Paper text:
The crystals belonged to a hitherto undescribed, tightly-packed tetragonal space group, diffracted to 2.0 Å resolution, and contained half a GF disulfide-linked dimer per asymmetric unit. We detected gelatinolytic activity, which points to a contaminant present in the purified hα2M sample. Accordingly, we conclude that the low pH of the crystallization assay, together with the crystallization process, achieved the separation of the LAP and GF moieties that we could not obtain by chromatography (see above). Taken together, these values indicated that P41212 was the correct space group, and the final model after model rebuilding and refinement contained residues A303-S414 and 23 solvent molecules. TGFβ2 is internally crosslinked by four disulfides forming a cysteine knot and a further intermolecular disulfide by symmetric C379 residues links two crystallographic symmetry mates to yield the functional dimer. Here, helix α3 of one protomer nestles into the concave face of the β-sheet of the other protomer. However, a major rearrangement is found within segment Y352-C380, which encompasses helix α3 plus the flanking linkers to strands β4 and β5. Owing to an outward movement of segment W354-D357, α3 is translated by maximally ~5.5 Å (at I370). This, in turn, causes downstream segment E373-C379 to be folded inward, with a maximal displacement of ~6.7 Å (at A374). The second protomer is rotated by ~10°, so that K396 at the tip of hairpin β6β7 is displaced by ~9 Å. Overall, we conclude that our mature structure may represent an inactive variant or be one of an ensemble of conformational states, which may still undergo an induced fit or selection fit mechanism to form a functional ternary ligand-receptor complex.
TGFβs were discovered in the early 1980s4, and three close orthologs are found in mammals (TGFβ1, TGFβ2, and TGFβ35). They are ubiquitously expressed and secreted throughout the body, where they are pleiotropically engaged in the physiology of nearly all tissues and cell types after activation and binding to TGFβ receptors of type I, II and III (TGFR-I, -II and -III). Human TGFβs are produced as latent glycosylated precursors (pro-TGFβs), which consist of an ~250-residue N-terminal pro-domain dubbed latency-associated protein (LAP) and a C-terminal ~110-residue mature growth-factor moiety (GF). In particular, human TGFβ2 is biosynthesized as a latent 394-residue precursor (pro-TGFβ2) arranged as a glycosylated homodimer of 91 kDa containing three glycan chains attached to each LAP. Human TGFβ2 GF is an elongated α/β-fold molecule consisting of an N-terminal helix α1 disemboguing into a fourfold antiparallel sheet of simple up-and-down connectivity.
Author numbering:
A (entry chain A), B (entry chain A): 303 to 414
Write the structure that this text describes.
Amino acid sequence: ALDAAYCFRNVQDNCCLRPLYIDFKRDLGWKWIHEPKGYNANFCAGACPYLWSSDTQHSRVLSLYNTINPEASASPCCVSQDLEPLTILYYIGKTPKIEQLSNMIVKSCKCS
Amino acid sequence: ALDAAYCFRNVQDNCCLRPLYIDFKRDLGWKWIHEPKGYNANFCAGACPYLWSSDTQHSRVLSLYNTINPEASASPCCVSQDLEPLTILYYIGKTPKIEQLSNMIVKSCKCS
């Protein structure tokens, strides 16, 4: 998979997970989250070679088209695959509460 | 929507549907399809401004992050949204048959 272990080994031009830490107050302007101060959101970026696409007929027809006619490219797009939640601390008045924020973290990537 | 009527008006740098005709024999090497000789598959391509992403928390957090910190971009990806089937003619020996090939055509685009 295009995850931390495979992708964080070196810098790669191809579709891969990229490290990113987001500080809620500083980078999002979210003051409602008291803890943690930030988290490793990560993101997906990089070139998609033509055979890296699947799960849709249009994508596999497009991949086959591209492999035969490269010069006239319609290159696939590096997108998120596995997403994970994050537990945070917020307040209801003076009472500290905890809740899960869904799909905050990207763990792996794929080509569209 | 980022469909033919909106997108085929002019050339646009931003995420939009792009016209593409694929000839089965000539461009795919598919000799099994006798009719039609090709079809308008189309494809999605172009720049995604930061607020064009939705449906995932990670995508909206990433869009918000990007709007605040543009220079340090993790730009969204222009992908297919609505897909349509195509009916074709093939043979089982000397008998002509027809069948639907699913999700062959892209009708609209979206930003990841």
